Amino acid sequence: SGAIYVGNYRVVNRHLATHNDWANLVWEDSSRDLLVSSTTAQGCDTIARCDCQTGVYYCSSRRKHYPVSFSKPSLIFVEASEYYPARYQSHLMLAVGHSEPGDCGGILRCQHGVVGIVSTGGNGLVGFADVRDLLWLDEE
């Protein structure tokens, strides 16, 4: 579990969104595994606006932050899970690291701020849903 809290937005994995998230919906995209809901309180996270390919992510199944090198956001084939069939997920970045079911929502960050959240795992790989292109998270 986990979310990004920027401005009056809460960014979560679409597959982990709550009823309150759907009842206060701003935007959602199944192909990216992302959903954004509105919040009453202002958040403290800042979004990175950069092309970094190195950063650090939080892994809840290890209680640890790990430095990683990650690929550029791309269209990657993801195997069937309890939440999605086998399909192409867009704006996904891969790295070598631990990610088991429950690690989704952990933040990946670089020197500029939040880059994205854990969205996929298994096989000694971890995939992150990028948020750096969502410029509207910085306004309204």
| Interface pick for ligand A1B2W out of 101, 133, 136, 138 (rule CB under 6 A) | 101
Q: Longest Cα pair distance anywhere in the chain, in angstroms? A: 40
Among 15, 29, 65, 98, the active-site one is 15
Kindly state the DSSP code that residue 84 receives in the 8-state scheme.
S
Q: Is 7 one of the binding residues for ligand A1B2W (CB under 6 A)?
A: no
Considering Cα of 89, then 83, then 67, then 49, what sign does the dihedral take? positive
Beta bridge partners of 74: 92
Task: Give the x/- contact pattern for ligand A1B2W in 29-68, rule: CB under 6 A.
Answer: ----x-----------------------------------
Distance (Å, rounded) from C-alpha 68 to C-alpha 56? 6
Residue 60 in 3-state DSSP? Answer: coil
Is residue 19 part of the annotated active site? The answer reads: no
Site for ligand A1B2W in 107-136 (CB under 6 A): 119-122
Q: Is 28 one of the binding residues for ligand A1B2W (CB under 6 A)?
A: no
> From its phi and psi, is residue 22 left (phi > 0), alpha (psi between -120 and 50) or beta?
alpha
CB of 61 to ligand A1B2W, least distance (A): 10
C-beta of 7 vs 78, nearer to ligand A1B2W: 78
Give the catalytic positions in this structure. 15, 33, 104
